[PDB]
Amino acid sequence: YFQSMLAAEAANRDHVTRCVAQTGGSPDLVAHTAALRLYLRVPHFLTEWTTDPDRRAAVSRALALDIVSMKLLDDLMDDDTGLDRVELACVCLRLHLRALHELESLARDPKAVTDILEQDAVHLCGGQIRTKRSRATNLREWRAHASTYGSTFLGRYGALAAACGGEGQPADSVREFAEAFAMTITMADDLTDYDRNGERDGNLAHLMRTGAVAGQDVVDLLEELRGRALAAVAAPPGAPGLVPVVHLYTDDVLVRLLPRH
């Protein structure tokens, strides 16, 4: 099942790029949203605890919609991309409105969705505002900024994934996996995004390159995140299928990322 994954990634990549295009997406944007592999695939992982296949394929795409929406919300603020700003915005909002719509139907408690989304919208947002204001300058201090725009971000789709997955789901363990997994990813993004498009202010790669964070710490943490992640997957019932993934990813930062630095 390092198949089931790319099949859902293909299925979610299709649903999204079809909403993107039919809304006025340009050939550079449908193309952009189609190439957001990780985002499109992540939903599959968040719904691993979900039993019925259809409802699984269901919530997997719903999440993929809002996740990309959110993504484009970024690209519009970061402003790098080079795509048109007008589209990025509409399409963003479009996709969202939609995810809300579908997620809202796959819910047991309709009111449930808007709950999760609101619960800490202040943390998620004030956290990414301040994150980019007072750029971090040390681990205990980067792992704090990464705990918001990263951990809490995915934490929520984790919760949604659970509120729309169908009763008998380790509600909070799903979230634990989400929040844990998410950070290993952020480190994966920082350790890579320094080399590729030369970055440096607040970056987790720079802070290592200037004795502001010991490589041994980075690792310690990366190893804790696996621990924390693998822990939540076990929680009963348990998501055997994710055990391989958690390793596959954490092992990838360790193997091909941390070495460059």
Ligand X SMILES: CC(C)=CCC/C(C)=C/COP(=O)(O)OP(=O)(O)O
What's the rounded Cα separation, in Å, for the pair 139 and 134? 14
Give Cα 37 to chain centroid, integer Å.
Answer: 11
88 binds, among a copy of itself, ligand X, none (CB under 5 to 8 A by kind): a copy of itself
The interface mask with ligand X, positions 150-179, x = CB under 6 A, is: x--x--------------------------
What's the rounded Cα separation, in Å, for the pair 116 and 104? 12
In the region spanning residues 20 to 39, those forming contacts with a copy of itself, defined by CB under 8 A, are 22-24
Q: Which of 187, 178, 189, 190 is nearest to 228 (CA)?
A: 178
Provide the minimum distance between the beta carbon of 168 and ligand X in the complex, in angstroms, as a whole number: 29
Residue 19's identity, in one-letter code, is C
189 three-class SS: helix
In the region spanning residues 44 to 103, those forming contacts with ligand X, defined by CB under 6 A, are 70-71, 73-74, 89-90, 93
Q: Which of 165, 149, 152 is nearest to 62 (CA)?
A: 165
100 binds, among ligand X, a copy of itself, none (CB under 5 to 8 A by kind): a copy of itself
101 binds, among a copy of itself, ligand X, none (CB under 5 to 8 A by kind): a copy of itself
Three-state SS for 10-69 is HHHHHHHHHHHHCCCCCCCCHHHHHCCHHHHHHHHHHCCCCCCHHHHHHHHHHHHHHHHH
The interface mask with ligand X, positions 8-27, x = CB under 6 A, is: --------------------
Stretch that binds ligand X, among 50-58, 98-106, 124-132, 232-240 (CB under 6 A): 124-132
Interaction of residue 135 with a copy of itself, rule CB under 8 A: no
Provide the minimum distance between the beta carbon of 249 and a copy of itself in the complex, in angstroms, as a whole number: 27
Chain positions contacting ligand X, by CB under 6 A: 70-71, 73-74, 89-90, 93, 124-125, 128, 149-150, 153, 186, 189, 193
